[PDB]
Write a protein that binds this ligand. Sequence first.
Ligand SMILES: O[C@@H]1[C@@H](O)[C@H](O[C@@H]2CO[C@@H](O)[C@H](O)[C@H]2O)OC[C@H]1O
Ligand SMILES: O[C@@H]1[C@@H](O)[C@H](O[C@@H]2CO[C@@H](O)[C@H](O)[C@H]2O)OC[C@H]1O
Ligand code: NA
Length: 330
Amino acid sequence: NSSLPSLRDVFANDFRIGAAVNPVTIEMQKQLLIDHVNSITAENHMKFEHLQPEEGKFTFQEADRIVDFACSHRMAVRGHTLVWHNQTPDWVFQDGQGHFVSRDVLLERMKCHISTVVRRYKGKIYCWDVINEAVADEGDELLRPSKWRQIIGDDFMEQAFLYAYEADPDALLFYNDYNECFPEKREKIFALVKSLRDKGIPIHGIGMQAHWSLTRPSLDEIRAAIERYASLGVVLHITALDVSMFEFHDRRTDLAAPTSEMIERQAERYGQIFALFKEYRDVIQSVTFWGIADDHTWLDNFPVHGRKNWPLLFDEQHKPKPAFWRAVSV
Ligand SMILES: O[C@@H]1[C@@H](O)[C@H](O[C@@H]2CO[C@@H](O)[C@H](O)[C@H]2O)OC[C@H]1O
Ligand SMILES: O[C@@H]1[C@@H](O)[C@H](O[C@@H]2CO[C@@H](O)[C@H](O)[C@H]2O)OC[C@H]1O
Ligand code: NA
């Protein structure tokens, strides 16, 4: 590493380089983070269930640890995430009888949560994924079904953004989602954000999760999505980048190690990805990987539980992979 290029420095004039972490991985991959990133995202500890597990009971300990680590190393922090159909406790949508609360009650709870969480980290966290994955990933419908939407109505997103803006008007507020480059979903996301923006809703950016594979999405699809979203006048952040060695249909579990072909194609894939990102440096301001080294990745258990994946730039021994060299040489 002594002579190894530093990711954040390599892209100093293009965009921040980040990593999703948790207190455990911060310790386990501490030096890698210190040497390469200038932005941090909580992989799970800033999600609803990990911040307010019970009404009125806030558990900021793990999140505080992540933020402290970031600030002590002059690293920016992205807040993930306020309103999502996943990892949100049941109490949020129920009353005493266990029945669903009303629209006004859920809005009160939403505002209180957003207000409390956002205010605590105001001045330390510069952006927030306010709404996460609201768009349907399948079907002809625009929106995915969720208790938030069901109880409040389709304007639940408008309210979420307004609440966050009030809590910290200096923060950049994002709509974050995956499969953001497949045409059908891209158009739904574009339509949604455009509609919010056309209503004066304070949404400042679109978060492209980029949970990609070696083949999907294509570079043309990525370029088209970047341009389509950028045309709305919003800032763009790649928020959870990883390049899986397995396509969606590939559910093998025997592979103890990636083939030379996989490693080679991944290197090419990452080089092409970053060449494209650099080309659009004017609209892309941050690129965060959902992790940093192959010794820790949510893809080891998703979508197939119990297997192993090698989706990042560094291997399990924290050594640069072929993908690292192509990525930093664009
Ligand atoms: O649960 C979500 C995953 O489904 C998502 O991964 C996508 C699954 O569908 C595939 O067709 C896509 O290629 C893949 O990106 O990642 C985000 C996670 O929250
Ligand atoms: O440890 C796991 C996390 O890595 C995972 O993070 C999700 C990745 O996919 C994105 O679509 C989501 O927004 C992001 O929260 O969540 C589950 C957790 O067990
Ligand atoms: Na930029």
